[PDB]
C-alpha cells in the first residue's frame, strides 16, 4: 500500500487515530482525540517503544453503534492492511461502543467521550 497515512503510521511511540470516511482512512485532528462520533468507525494505532529498539503495535478498530456496514467493514479491512504493512507485528482489537477493552479506554487519560453523529455511509 502507498497510502500517505500508512507511510505515517507507527513511525514513533504514541497514539494515532484515523476515521473511516467514505472508504478512505482520514486522520483525526489531535485536538479531537477521544471524542468519538457514534455514527462512525475509527482505526487507532498505539505505538509503544520496546527496550530492544523496535516498536510494539496494537491496532484497535472502534465501531460506533450507528456506523454503517461500509464504515465498520472498512475499519476492519484497513486494520488488516495496516497490520500487514507493519509486517504483521500488530495485535488487532475489535472495540465496540460500550464494550471497549480496559487497555483501549486507558489510552485516553481524560476518559473517552461519545457524541452522536458523524459522516454518512459511502454506499450506493
Amino acid at each position: 500500500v502507498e497510502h500517505p497515512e500508512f507511510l505515517k503510521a507507527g513511525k514513533e511511540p504514541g497514539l494515532q487515530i484515523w476515521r473511516v470516511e467514505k472508504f478512505d482512512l482520514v486522520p483525526v485532528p489531535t485536538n479531537l482525540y477521544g471524542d468519538f462520533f457514534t455514527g462512525d468507525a475509527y482505526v487507532i494505532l498505539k505505538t509503544v517503544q520496546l527496550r530492544n529498539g523496535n516498536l510494539q503495535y496494537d491496532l484497535h478498530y472502534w465501531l460506533g453503534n450507528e456506523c454503517s456496514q461500509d464504515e465498520s467493514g472498512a475499519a476492519a479491512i484497513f486494520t488488516v492492511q495496516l497490520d500487514d504493512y507493519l509486517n504483521g507485528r500488530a495485535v488487532q482489537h475489535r472495540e465496540v461502543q460500550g464494550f471497549e477493552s480496559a487497555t483501549f479506554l486507558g489510552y485516553f487519560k481524560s476518559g473517552l467521550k461519545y457524541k452522536k453523529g458523524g459522516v454518512a455511509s459511502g454506499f450506493k
Binding site: 472508504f23 478512505d24 465501531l63 456496514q69 467493514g73 476492519a76 475489535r94
Partner: protein, 368 residues
Amino acid sequence: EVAALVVDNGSGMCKAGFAGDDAPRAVFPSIVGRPRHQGVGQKDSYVGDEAQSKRGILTLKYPIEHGIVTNWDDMEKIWHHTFYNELRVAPEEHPVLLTEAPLNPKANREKMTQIMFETFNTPAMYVAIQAVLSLYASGRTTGVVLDSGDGVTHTVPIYEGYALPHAILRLDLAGRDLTDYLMKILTERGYSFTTTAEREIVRDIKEKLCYVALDFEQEMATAASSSSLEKSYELPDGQVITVGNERFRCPEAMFQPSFLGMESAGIHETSYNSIMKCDIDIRKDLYANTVLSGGTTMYPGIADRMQKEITALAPSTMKIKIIAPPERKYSVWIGGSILASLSTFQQMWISKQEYDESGPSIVHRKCF
C-alpha cells in the same frame, strides 16, 4: 473515477454488481441452457432466468458444483452474460473482483485469472475467498464463518484477516439437498412435487415456512399432539396444502445429517470441530465471533439453535456468540463491494501488466 465490478459465483445463484453499491444489481441462477435437441429457440444458448424460463426447449447445465467451477466453457458464458446482459458494461473498462470457494483448486484460480485477462481483457482483477468477505462485511477480522449456500457448507476459521486453511472443514449438505429433502417428506403427507415448477413451489415453502427448532424432539412431540405448528400453504392455482412438522424437520437435517442418510456431523459440531483445530490461544475469539452467511443459514431460529448447540460442546467458561446478519444471503457480495471500494485497494489488484509479465501463476502471490 473508475468503477470496479464485484461477482460472486455461487453454485446456485450468481450475484453481480458495482463496488460501492450496498447490494448486487443482478442476482440470477448459475445456469447455462443450450438447445435440447438439434433441429431449427433463437440464440446459441441462454443464461440465468431466461434459460430457466425456456427450459422446455433447453437442457440446463450448472457450471459450478460445490462452489468449484467444473465447466469452463459454460462459466465463460455465464461471465459473458453477466458483463454484457446483466451489468451492461464493457468488461475491458472495469477492474473485476471475483469470489472463490475455500480451498479452491490452484489450477482453477489460474484458469479464472487467464479467462478474465485473455478472454475479457479486464484491466485488473482480484480473487477473494467468500468466507473472508462475509467476515469483513460483519466488521470483524477474526471469527469462524459458517457459509451454507447451494453447493456445500463450509466452516472457515479466520484470524486477523486471514483464513486458517488447516482448520477449514465441511459438511457436504446444502440448499439443494434440503429442497430435495423437503420434496420427499412432503410426499409422505400425500403430496407429489416432481416437476421443475413443483420443485420451485417446494423451495418457496422451504424459504417461507421452514424454521429451526430450539428443541427438536420436543418440537416433534408438540406436533404429534397438536395442529399448533401446522401452517397452510396456498399453491399457485388455489389448492391449499398443510405443512406440519416438515417445517422444522427439513432444516433439522443441518444439525442431524443422518436425516439424509449422512454419517457426517451437523453444522454445530463442524463449527466446534473447526475451532478445535485452531491454536488454543485464539479459540475464545472464534467462539465469540461465529458468523453465519449464505442462503441456507436464513432459517428463523438457526442462530438460537447454533448458540445452544455450541454452548453444550464448549466449556461453560467460553462465551458463545452467533452473528446472523439479516443481509447474510448477500454478505459475501457486500464484503466484496466494500473491499473493492477502499482507497487502499488500488495496488491489491492484479493488473494487465502483471498478468502479461508472470502469466496466470501471478494469482498465487497477489491473492492469498
